């Protein structure tokens, strides 16, 4: 009766909460992947400029 | 740099997802408590009408 309508409403609200959780999870994963790429890019750029300076200090002596 | 802005944005989105999850959890608990009360009320009403009939069948014989 109003029990079965309310059971259906509880099931419908649980699905909405789960689907919204999944969309926010996908926003978080997307931003974290972009963050991971930028952190990697920063490590690579610092790595290269320190190594360039090591070669410049080696070429001054020769 | 844009790394720290993005770390803050990831932290802010995780808080929003958690707070929205909590509000939907409270809608589900609220509907489930109301469902529990109606199911209890239905069991009590069926219980009483069967017991009333048991007393009526006992009083017909006396």
Residue numbers in the entry:
A (entry chain A), B (entry chain A): 876 to 937
From the paper:
SEC-MALS with six fragments derived from the 3HB/SAH junction indicated that a rather conserved region (aa 875–940) can self-dimerize with KDApp of ~19 µM (∆G° ~−6.4 kcal/mol) obtained from titration. This minimal region corresponds to the last half of the 3HB (i.e., the 2nd and 3rd helix) and the first part of the SAH. Crystals of the 875–940 peptide diffracted to 2.1 Å resolution. Clear electron density for all residues from 876 to 937 indicates that they form an extended helix that dimerizes in an antiparallel manner. This antiparallel dimerization is stabilized by multiple apolar contacts involving 13 residues from each helix, and six polar interactions involving R892 with D900, and T888 with S906 (via a water molecule). At the center of the interface, the structure highlights how residues T888, R892 and V903 contribute to the dimerization. Three mutations (T888D.R892E.V903D) were introduced into the 875–940 peptide to assess the impact on proximal dimerization. SEC-MALS confirms that the T888D.R892E.V903D mutant stays monomeric even up to 43 µM (peak concentration in the SEC-MALS experiment) while the WT counterpart is dimeric in similar conditions. The inter-head distance is indeed compatible with the large (~30 nm) stepping previously reported when Myo6 walks processively. Myo6 is unique in that its antiparallel coiled-coil and Lever arm in the dimer are derived from the unfolding of a 3HB, with the contribution of the SAH.
